[PDB]
Design a protein around this ligand. Structure first.
Ligand code: 8DG
Ligand code: MN
Ligand code: NA
Ligand code: NA
Length: 156
């Protein structure tokens, strides 16, 4: 048994494009990703996701919808990362570069998988199909998956 820490991840997914941010420092630096971070004491997971989206991208949204949950384990780290993944298609301002992220839109036939976390190749297609999922990935360092599970679910 390991303990886990709560994180969020938000994908702004529109009919023909998705907003990603280039992580400028910290965990996952150099990879395009959705927006998110640690859940803080007192806030719901969904509200922490909304907060991180605003902090990192400048976007303010009324609602998010849950699309998946991914648990990450790293060799040498006792704590698991329990990542709650959300989407929305509905925005009403423009993204802005933050200290953490440079936002950029990608067409959905140009998803930059080689410059994303390696596990995203497995679960992001499910997100694109609007299928909910649970995943688990064990990493050695930043690049190498040693074990993983991925399943479609009816409820996140
Ligand atoms: N797509 C994808 N996202 C991941 C993976 N692993 C992982 O932690 N994430 C997400 C979850 C969070 O959105 C983010 C990690 O949180 P963070 O380090 O940005 O947290 P934060 O904003 O609170 O921290 P800080 O950088 O402000 O100090 O990366 C992965 O393998 N794939
Ligand atoms: Mn944070
Ligand atoms: Na953050
Ligand atoms: Na973050």
């Amino acid at each position: 048994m390991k303990a886990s820490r709560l994180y969020t991840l938000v994908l702004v997914l529109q009919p023909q494009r998705v907003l990603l941010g280039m992580k400028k420092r910290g965990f996952g630096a150099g990879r395009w990703n959705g927006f998110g971070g640690k859940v803080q004491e007192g806030e719901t997971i969904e509200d922490g996701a909304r907060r991180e989206l605003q902090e990192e991208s400048g976007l303010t949204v009324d609602a998010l919808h849950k699309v998946g949950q991914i648990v990450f384990e790293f060799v040498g780290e006792p704590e698991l990362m329990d990542v709650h993944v959300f989407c929305t298609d509905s925005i009403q301002g423009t993204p802005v570069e933050s200290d953490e992220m440079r936002p950029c839109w990608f067409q959905l036939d140009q998803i930059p998988f080689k410059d994303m976390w390696p596990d995203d190749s497995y679960w992001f297609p499910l997100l694109l199909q609007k299928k909910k999922f649970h995943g688990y990935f064990k990493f050695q360092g930043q690049d190498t998956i040693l074990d993983y599970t991925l399943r479609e679910v009816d409820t996140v």
